[PDB]
Enzyme design. Structure first.
Site, short mmCIF file in Angstrom:
data_model
loop_
_atom_site.label_atom_id
_atom_site.label_comp_id
_atom_site.label_asym_id
_atom_site.label_seq_id
_atom_site.Cartn_x
_atom_site.Cartn_y
_atom_site.Cartn_z
N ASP A 144 84.36 70.84 63.85
CA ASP A 144 82.95 71.09 63.61
C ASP A 144 82.74 72.47 63.03
OD1 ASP A 144 81.11 68.86 64.83
OD2 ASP A 144 82.66 69.24 66.37
N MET A 218 78.12 59.09 69.98
CA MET A 218 77.57 60.27 69.30
C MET A 218 76.17 60.01 68.76
SD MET A 218 77.71 63.41 68.66
CE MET A 218 79.29 63.58 69.54
N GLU A 259 82.86 51.36 77.31
CA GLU A 259 83.92 52.08 76.65
C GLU A 259 85.12 51.19 76.48
OE1 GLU A 259 84.59 55.26 75.40
OE2 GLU A 259 82.38 55.43 75.49
N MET A 260 85.64 51.18 75.26
CA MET A 260 86.77 50.36 74.88
C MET A 260 87.90 51.27 74.39
SD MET A 260 86.44 47.32 72.24
CE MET A 260 85.21 46.44 73.17
N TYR A 279 73.32 57.23 64.29
CA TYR A 279 72.95 58.59 64.65
C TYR A 279 71.42 58.69 64.76
CZ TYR A 279 77.77 59.51 63.36
OH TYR A 279 79.13 59.51 63.30
N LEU A 296 84.70 56.92 59.24
CA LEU A 296 86.05 56.89 58.69
C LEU A 296 86.76 55.57 58.97
CD1 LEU A 296 88.63 58.04 57.45
CD2 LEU A 296 89.02 59.24 59.65
O1 LIG Z 1 84.23 52.68 73.28
C1 LIG Z 1 84.58 53.41 72.38
C2 LIG Z 1 83.66 54.30 71.76
C3 LIG Z 1 84.16 55.27 70.92
N1 LIG Z 1 85.39 55.04 70.34
C4 LIG Z 1 85.87 55.91 69.26
O2 LIG Z 1 85.49 57.23 69.49
C5 LIG Z 1 85.39 57.92 68.26
C6 LIG Z 1 84.25 58.91 68.25
O3 LIG Z 1 83.07 58.26 68.54
P1 LIG Z 1 81.75 59.16 68.52
O4 LIG Z 1 80.52 58.33 68.49
O5 LIG Z 1 81.68 60.10 69.64
O6 LIG Z 1 81.87 60.04 67.19
P2 LIG Z 1 81.76 59.54 65.67
O7 LIG Z 1 82.56 58.36 65.33
O8 LIG Z 1 80.43 59.06 65.29
O9 LIG Z 1 82.09 60.83 65.11
C7 LIG Z 1 85.39 56.87 67.16
O10 LIG Z 1 86.78 56.85 66.74
C8 LIG Z 1 85.30 55.56 67.89
O11 LIG Z 1 86.26 54.76 67.26
C9 LIG Z 1 86.30 54.18 70.94
O12 LIG Z 1 87.48 54.15 70.57
N2 LIG Z 1 85.89 53.37 71.97
#
Ligand SMILES: O=c1ccn([C@@H]2O[C@H](COP(=O)(O)OP(=O)(O)O)[C@@H](O)[C@H]2O)c(=O)[nH]1
EC number: 2.4.1.264
Length: 370
Positions: A144, A218, A259-260, A279, A296
């Protein structure tokens, strides 16, 4: 061996893995790897730190997946009070924190060949690292921008002060370069993906129908799904790890998952018709388009994405909407539904990404300056 030390406000043991975890996994493959977790105190109980489950391990080394982990717990940690009148006490707290590292940090610094500082509180320890081990390669990983995560003025100043002395400033996004007061050591190394994604993405978790996926908490905006689920009764919205439960406005075409594990999310992404990065705010940095992990991962698969206009950025297959604006949500989805799946974005795996994080000068395309 190379020996790596990571400083971060994450702890490596957290189930919610962020980018620095994926890098640390790679480091753990390359040599002895330590992950020193910062910004954790007794105060951390007041607001509600995700590392609290680890509290009974605080200030001791724990091994986790081949990484030596240490959750440093002080009584208080320094933070942005967000009150300009409290800045001299902020600076005092930061100076104090930085002046009192635990011996364990010092030892690990000494033992390291490479110290990785994540954007944030780890900035306060860059000078220390250089004093303890001037031979260590000092790598700042800018997950960040400092101002975006709204660090204390002290951290911003300190970062500006020490930035030139870093061996590597590895920006997730070139868009972060404007607020980095250095040039020759500033590189672009975006997030990686696992080397494995395409294998992880089969078999399909979905039966027949149109499936939309959102993964991650997020700035999670449930209102997106309230609107989208009503407007698209024929679409099943798979809301994974949103950090909240079944909002009462979700239609029945919304499936809310806890959560997965990352690997398990991938099928839901690969086999979706479109992805969503819901978002809640457009008060986001320009770099989020680049640094968004879910986006991504959608992009890896060429999964058309619906996201706020502020994170569409320099990307095809992203259909922007304005949060809170139903029509724009609906318009974006309608477009994402008809968007072709094309792999526009080149996504290096985590190993190749780590290579570039560590030795960006060996990959001259990462250079952000002449
Ligand atoms: O249950 C979940 C929720 C989140 N993610 C992963 O956590 C990462 C970050 O998610 P976040 O929303 O915090 O940030 P963002 O993708 O929007 O930057 C992403 O790779 C998602 O694939 C995951 O693997 N399992």
């Amino acid at each position: 061996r190379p020996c790596y030390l990571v400083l971060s406000s994450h702890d490596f043991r957290t189930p919610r893995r962020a980018n620095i975890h994926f890098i640390t996994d790679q480091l753990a493959l390359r040599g002895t790897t330590r992950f020193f977790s910062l910004r954790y105190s007794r105060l951390s109980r007041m607001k509600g730190d995700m590392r609290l489950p680890l509290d009974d391990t605080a200030n001791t080394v724990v091994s986790h997946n081949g990484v030596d982990c240490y959750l440093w717990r002080t009584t208080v940690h320094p933070f942005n009070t967000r009150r300009s009148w409290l800045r001299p006490v902020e600076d005092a707290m930061f100076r104090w924190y930085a002046a009192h590292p635990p011996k364990q940090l010092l030892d690990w610094m000494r033992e390291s060949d490479v110290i990785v500082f994540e954007s944030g509180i780890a900035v306060a320890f860059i000078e220390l690292a250089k004093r303890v081990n001037p031979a260590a390669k000092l790598v700042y990983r800018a997950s960040d921008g400092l101002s975006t995560i709204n660090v204390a003025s002290y951290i911003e100043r300190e970062f500006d002060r020490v930035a030139p002395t870093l061996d590597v400033i590895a920006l997730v996004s070139p868009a972060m370069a404007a607020e980095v007061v250095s040039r020759d050591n500033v590189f672009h190394v975006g997030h990686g993906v696992d080397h494995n994604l395409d294998q992880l993405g089969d078999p399909s978790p979905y039966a027949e129908g149109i499936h939309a996926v959102a993964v991650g908490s997020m700035l999670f905006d449930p209102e997106f799904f309230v609107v989208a689920s009503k407007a698209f009764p024929q679409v099943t919205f798979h809301v994974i790890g949103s950090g909240m439960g079944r909002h009462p406005g979700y239609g029945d075409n919304v499936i809310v998952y806890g959560e997965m594990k990352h690997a398990q999310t991938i099928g839901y992404i690969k086999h979706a018709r479109f992805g969503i990065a819901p978002y809640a705010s457009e008060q986001v940095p320009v770099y989020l388009a680049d640094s968004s992990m879910k986006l991504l991962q959608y992009d890896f698969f060429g999964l058309p994405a619906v996201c706020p206009n502020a994170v569409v950025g320099p990307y095809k297959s992203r259909f922007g909407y304005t949060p809170g604006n139903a029509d724009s949500v609906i318009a974006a989805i309608t477009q994402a539904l008809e968007a072709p799946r094309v792999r526009y974005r080149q996504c290096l795996n985590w190993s190749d990404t780590t290579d570039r994080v560590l030795d960006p000068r060996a990959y001259p395309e990462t250079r952000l300056y002449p």
